[PDB]
Copies of this chain bind each other. A is one copy, B any other.
């Protein structure tokens, strides 16, 4: 019904490398493993739990089609 879900779900389903930018000026990288009401797991060497409230932007490494409905 909303946007968050399909956007993250395409990125993950596609295992596309993404960048996640934090409010503190840090730039995380890796693939979107899973997500939540509150968190995303970004997979790199380890799984890391990023809190949505500390996220500024989510930026794919390339155009991902069909981020649909």
Contacts and interface: CB of A to CB of B under 8 A. Distances in A.
Nearest to A57: B50
Nearest to A10: B47
Chain A binding surface SS class: mixed
A14 B42 CA distance: 20
Copies of the chain in the assembly: 6
B22 A48 contact: no
A64 B59 CA distance: 26
A26 to B, nearest CB: 6
Given A2-B37, A7-B39, A41-B66, 12 more contacts: A1-B38, A2-B39, A4-B36, A4-B38, A7-B41, A7-B49, A21-B24, A34-B68, A46-B61, A46-B64, A48-B57, A50-B57
